[PDB]
Design a protein around this ligand. Structure first.
Ligand SMILES: Cn1c(=O)c2c(ncn2C[C@H](O)CO)n(C)c1=O
Ligand SMILES: Cn1c(=O)c2c(ncn2C[C@H](O)CO)n(C)c1=O
Lengths: 584, 585
């Protein structure tokens, strides 16, 4: 009857009935014409939900019909009842569930696979609402770049991530882990046979999930440009790219982010020649991706104009090349429309975004657990390619990555708070509410210098703390608010204890120190209220006791590796410690 | 060529007219018999201290000093002034001309004469005086200090010393309301017993001798009754308390409502009105009554552009002659912009009195407030004619900020807070001034993280250089030169503080010893932070871990100590460095 949480939000969805229960066995129509990856995804779903396939038809049992628009299948047409994927953009699809029948029509193969993923999300306990849906992405390339420093994702993390992207309609995965010598330290060298199977597994998994596996080369460590050596090194770049092509790689990136020979003309020459001699020569390779040595607005621009390097790079690099930038800074609050317009103007095309959130390599004590935040909802005007750099913490990165999927697939309707709530609801099931209490305190990233991004920590509790100080300093009665805040702090502690006892090991292993840290702070916040109450009661012994406890809790948090809620739970203790009620 | 020395306050009008001259070891004194008595005593005190004798009979070889008031008939004074005059200046005004062996001081009144002397005292260095024409007068009529801080009281000797300091800097108001004198609050009805008489007399006499109005602060809010027979008894107690003070020589009074448990605006106002009528008006020689209403900062007084009930009623009831104090937009606040003064003064339909809560540190005692008057609108005088600051329990170090309040209130229009700050330290600390500046520069900003904050930011130039260090490092720009420069600043900080520890007089050192040790610790931690950065640039892991451990111990020592200084600068720098991972830029 009711529509389950969906992610991404589909473009068009209307409830057209009251839904029905899918029978224990079903009629499968189109299984041989439809996209193989979509059909394999469907079969895996039905198999896991104990829904058998009928070898012969039966008007009683539910009928599921699947295929592309370019297929002449009139059963699909009949089931679709007008609505079609014919005029939708790439990766788009139509889905109709109406009395005992579900029709999935992709605009293409990719689109068909996405139709299935939505279907999977619509079904609960063999029940499905009945709706009419047409859907397609706001932006063409949506995904993740594995560009963080620190402990690398394991082979199993990547495989799991790859499936998670497919399931959320993310179509891009840029493979450039700092731990793989063949992306950088041995960039010339083709993969040895002893590495071939691992790579093949990533390449295959990506393909079966409609994910573009982008191989990222950073030749900057030692590439040469001039004379015979430059020629040799260029040929090695070709050599390497085709050994990868022979494994099935069809997307490439070349990074100039870390080179010291800051020569714009030479960087772009290598890109242009690679583009001619490889990308275009092959015909089925996707547009070349690049990161220029200047890759954030502050490094790219002075006074509304490009700097020397960026001016030359933008003038030299072929228009068919995806150029990545990070926004106004490497790690920064926002990408407002005006920033995208500026950089897009300079490069005379739609840009690619490398968004350093929720990555935490620069401030590892803190987990980044908030939604996409600060990215203008009109960005698609100037951006055709959107990626996020995640944490070394693969599992917990799913919260933020989940909201990125929504932002990039349905940008105009993206609401960061509802997206954030939905991500945790869909990922954490019965522990969703407790996870929210904890994660609410861990959204803001800030290394106290050059790197800051994210939604503020626990903003509503922050507003309440502010009101307590106003009331106390204005001689107004705060007894009801003090009471409310004790409730807030007890609830922080309780939720974190719950998460400790009940979280899956795969999540708990990423966040146990931060859980303890939040508990410590909740206990200090409580002791801080005790100080205020002692001063209102003029009780010197109760004050001194609360004060030593509050101070100890704060000292524990400060010296601990884990970091959380700095401006809210932690700062509150310092505010209370410096507050002297006797002065008014 | 004798240059003009530092002067405080900055005189309204000063023109250098000659190259200056030497004041003989013996001088001719002309007018000392008709001129203001306190002014003359201040002059003799100065002459004596600088081994300058007074000629018994005229001697045409000697420097001639002529002193008097405008309405005094002295032909030598008129001749020496050569057209310059104090005749059309406001009260406390005076003229001073030093020209060719003659120094003429003409006050518009007795107070102005005294202040002419104070300027003369500042003009003379080693018997040399510049040749200048001066006409001078204050922007604001009442300038001074309220002893209104919580904490350890000023001693009797601190107060006597403060009063003399006010006289030298032309501050004419001292509001005596120490929390720890019972007769001010806990025993407000009771007149001073015989045991306390000498002590009170000394303060009153020292104030008068220094042209300082000694305001007695009464806080009856503790237990004053308003209705019926008890209300009548308490009002008569107020009257008999005030006349016992009057008999001791007190001519200024403040009555406070800041701490009363009710908000009975009409009753507060009627007590003042009646006191005004039966005492202030009746005596004829009592200055305007001073009050602090129960709501005394804009936040407590105003809601949506309009007075709150208490304020509206108090404003409606209180007599127009009464001085009403407010502290600005908050009790302890960054600024009083012109608009705030305009709003409150409009509500009260009168020129307001300011109770400015800086350099008071009672709400964050680990930090010394060593900055200038900061955030006060330079056109505030349009709406304000009474300016006081609430200082620290630390009487000696309060002089830096008070010195700047003297200059802001006497010469408001030309007040430059950086220059006033520098001049305050130069004039107070002599040979240790440059070192004192290094230290005090890290201790101007007050912030308890909640309701209270005010003052110039700590060490802003250094803060801008630290910012630029992180900009360079995160932009992969070479930072060697800046790093070297910062090593120099941190070494300077430590060396200034060590010299201060060794050479500060005990009266100053006593108040700042812990803060000195704290700045040294922070400086050492700052140096260690640089060593961390350098070790990361050199890819030296062992050098990194060793610098880091020092940085963290220095920071930890700073955080756990009572003393607080340079929170956003020297202290924050270490935390910034500890959170920065250079290995990934
Ligand atoms: C634009 N860009 C990055 O921002 C980046 C990177 N490797 C790491 N980062 C950013 C880092 O994760 C933020 O601390 N690479 C290889 C990159 O090209
Ligand atoms: C306007 N006002 C004050 O601001 C004040 C005060 N006693 C203390 N203060 C302020 C305090 O020193 C700052 O914490 N009194 C008695 C007062 O009238």
């Amino acid at each position: 009857v009711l529509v389950p949480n969906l992610n991404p939000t589909p473009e068009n969805l209307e409830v057209v009935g009251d839904g029905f229960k899918i029978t224990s066995s079903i009629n499968l129509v189109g299984e041989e014409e439809a996209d193989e990856n979509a059909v394999n995804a469907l079969r895996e779903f039905l198999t896991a939900n104990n829904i058998e396939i009928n070898s012969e038809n039966d008007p009683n049992s539910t009928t599921l019909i699947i295929g592309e628009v370019d297929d002449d299948i009139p059963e699909l047409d009949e089931a679709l009842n007008g609505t079609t994927a014919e005029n939708l953009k790439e990766e788009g699809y139509a889905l109709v569930s109406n009395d005992g029948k579900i029709a999935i029509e992709g605009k293409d193969g990719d689109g068909t696979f996405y139709g299935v993923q939505t279907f999977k999300q619509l079904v609960k306990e063999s029940n499905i609402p009945e709706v009419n849906i047409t859907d397609y992405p706001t932006v063409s390339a949506r995904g993740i770049v594995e560009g963080f420093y620190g402990t690398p994702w394991t082979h199993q993390d990547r495989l799991d991530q790859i499936k998670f992207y497919g399931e959320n309609k993310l179509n891009t995965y840029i493979y450039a882990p700092k731990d793989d010598p063949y992306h950088r330290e041995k960039w010339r060298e083709p993969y040895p046979e002893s590495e071939m199977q691992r790579m093949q597994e990533l390449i295959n998994a990506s393909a079966e999930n409609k994910v573009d596996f982008v191989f990222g080369i950073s030749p900057g460590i030692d590439i040469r440009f001039d004379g015979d050596a430059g020629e040799e090194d260029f040929n090695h770049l070709i050599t390497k790219a085709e050994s990868l092509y022979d494994m099935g790689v069809r997307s490439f990136a070349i990074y100039w982010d870390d080179i010291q020979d800051k020569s714009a003309a030479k960087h772009a020459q290598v890109l242009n020649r690679f583009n001619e001699e490889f990308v275009k020569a092959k015909g089925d390779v996707k547009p070349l991706i690049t990161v220029p040595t200047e890759y954030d607005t502050g490094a790219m621009v002075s006074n509304g104009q490009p700097r020397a390097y960026t001016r030359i790079f933008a003038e030299t690099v072929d228009p068919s090349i995806e150029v990545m930038w990070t926004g106004p800074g490497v790690v920064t609050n926002e990408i407002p429309l005006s920033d995208a317009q500026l950089i897009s103007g300079i490069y005379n095309r739609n840009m690619a975004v490398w968004w350093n959130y929720p990555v935490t390599d620069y401030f590892k004590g803190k987990l980044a657990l908030g939604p996409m935040h600060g990215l203008d909802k009109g960005l698609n005007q100037y951006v055709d390619f959107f990626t996020v750099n995640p944490m070394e913490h693969a599992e917990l990165s799913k919260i933020s990555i989940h909201t990125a999927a929504d932002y990039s697939w349905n940008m105009d309707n993206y609401d960061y708070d509802k997206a954030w709530n939905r991500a945790i609801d869909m990922l954490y099931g019965d522990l969703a509410e407790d996870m929210k209490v904890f994660a609410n305190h861990s959204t803001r990233m800030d290394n106290k210098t050059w790197a800051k991004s994210g939604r503020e920590d626990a903003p509503e509790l922050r507003a309440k703390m502010d009101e307590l100080w106003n009331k106390l300093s204005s001689k107004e009665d705060a007894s009801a608010l003090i009471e409310e805040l004790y409730g807030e702090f007890a609830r922080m502690e309780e939720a974190c204890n719950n998460l400790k006892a009940n979280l899956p090991e795969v999540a708990l292993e990423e966040c146990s120190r931060q859980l303890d840290e939040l508990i410590t702070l909740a206990q200090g916040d409580k002791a801080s209220l005790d100080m205020i109450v002692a001063q209102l009661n003029e009780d010197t012994e109760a004050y001194e006791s609360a004060k030593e406890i509050a101070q100890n809790k704060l000292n524990t948090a400060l010296s601990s590796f884990a970091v959380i809620s700095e401006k809210v739970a932690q700062s509150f203790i310092q505010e209370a410690l410096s507050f002297d009620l006797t002065l008014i």
